[PDB]
Design brief:
By secondary structure, the chain is an alpha+beta fold. 26% of the residues lie in helices and 25% in strands. It contains 9 helices and 21 strands. Strands 2, 3, 5, 8, 9, 10 and 19 form a 7-stranded mixed sheet that branches. Strand 9 and strand 10 form a beta hairpin. Helix 4 crosses helix 9. The radius of gyration is 22 Å and the shape is globular.
Length: 409
């Protein structure tokens, strides 16, 4: 199984980050975060990256400057994104909407869009520099809720990176919000969709390796499972494989309980009554939780883990009509420690330079299924696994063994 090493590196020069406040005074309120965006597993950050080719007619305009000023005007409507989150009484998190400002970095990079390769595909080099981690930012509470970096290129293109605080929205929200920002950058005076905020309706020694698996091997793994389970998604399959291997490789007590947790967006999977509000941009995620004992995962074939993953998916999606509060629920209980997390990154913003050349995303195991078409014309999936060297080599060994077999028969 191949490793993918990023072989591009460049200087980045950044100015000092600036607080962007809404261009117009906004309401000073104390808003509540819903019970979905409040849950522990979602108390992280959520990151994205956009690549824009140079446009000659846009020569008189500085993308950082258009975007920064757009941002001011955008924060007028999305004024929670200029607030800080913090601890309510009891154990609930709220947004202090006082226009403190989002963070914005203007940067330049000694490199050109072309030097990234054909095509633009992740994982990207030097991303830690494209979107800097200003010290005193990475906490959930009392930090800016949005951090964005515009970095312009020697070729006249530019990269736009952004990190949202994940208690405020999810990837789908991000899409809406990014489009809103784009229309305001593009001359509009209001987003096409006017945002609402009604989160009450939802209350009541480590080493890294990235691996490419060709659709060849995926095909093999598919043909090596029970036919009644052969119709799964390739995400489902690969997550089965990772749960299985990570557990074997983790060398834990055969009695330990093993959890395989992933986000599933239910914005468009359920038909809600009452419907959702038109400008809702709160978190809308179910967390299927596939469990098994260590020893069953290790002793049984991949079909056991796979079947369990699909029963998990179904169980969390079983009901398809009802209220949000009945249909969408937090992850039950304290997220375990033996858990493993997998996000699916397999499934049109314009600021004046057109649509992006690429647009995507920057103690237990947390990994991503990243689409990646290879050097020679294989679609496939890149998995950025990171573990301790002991665990990590054992993880590769076991996943390699499964690979050899699945095709070799």
């Amino acid at each position: 199984m191949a490793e993918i090493k990023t072989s591009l590196t460049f200087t980045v020069r950044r100015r000092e980050p600036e607080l962007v406040v809404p261009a117009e005074p906004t309401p000073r309120e104390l808003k509540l975060l819903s019970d979905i965006d409040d849950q522990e597993i979602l108390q992280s950050h959520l990151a994205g990256i956009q690549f824009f080719r140079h446009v000659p007619k846009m020569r008189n305009k500085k993308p950082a400057t258009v975007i920064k000023e757009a941002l001011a005007k955008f924060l007028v409507f999305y004024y929670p994104f200029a607030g800080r989150v913090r601890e309510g009484p009891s154990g609930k998190l709220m947004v202090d909407c006082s226009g403190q400002g989002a963070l914005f970095i203007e940067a330049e990079a000694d490199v050109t869009l072309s030097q990234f390769g054909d095509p633009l595909q992740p994982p990207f080099p030097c991303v830690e520099e494209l979107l800097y981690n200003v010290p005193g930012t990475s906490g959930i509470i009392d930090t800016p809720l949005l951090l964005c970096q515009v970095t312009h290129l020697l070729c006249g293109g530019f990269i736009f990176a952004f990190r949202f605080n994940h208690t405020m929205t999810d990837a789908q929200g991000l899409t809406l919000i990014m489009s809103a920002l784009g229309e305001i950058a593009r001359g509009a005076k209001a987003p096409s969709i006017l945002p609402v905020w009604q989160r009450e309706l939802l209350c009541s020694d480590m080493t890294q390796k990235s691996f490419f698996i060709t659709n060849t091997e995926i095909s093999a793994l598919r043909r090596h499972v029970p036919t009644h389970l052969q119709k799964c998604t390739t995400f489902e399959l690969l997550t089965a494989c990772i749960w299985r291997c990570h557990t074997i490789a983790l060398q834990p007590d055969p009695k330990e309980e093993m959890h395989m947790i992933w986000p599933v967006n239910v914005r468009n999977k359920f038909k809600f009554i009452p419907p959702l509000p038109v400008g809702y941009y709160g978190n809308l995620l179910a967390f299927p939780d596939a469990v098994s004992t260590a020893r069953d995962l290790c002793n049984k074939p991949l079909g056991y883990a796979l079947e369990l993953v699909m029963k998990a998916r179904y169980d969390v999606t079983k009901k398809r009509v009802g209220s949000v509060s009945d249909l969408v629920k937090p992850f039950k209980g304290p997220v375990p420690a033996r858990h493993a997390i997998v996000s699916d990154l397999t499934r049109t913003v314009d600021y004046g330079w057109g649509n992006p050349a690429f647009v995507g995303p920057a103690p237990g195991l947390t990994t991503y299924l990243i689409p990646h078409t290879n050097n020679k014309g294989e679609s496939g999936i890149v998995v950025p696994i990171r573990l301790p060297s002991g665990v990590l080599d054992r993880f590769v060994k076991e996943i390699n063994n499964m690979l050899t077999q699945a095709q070799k028969n």
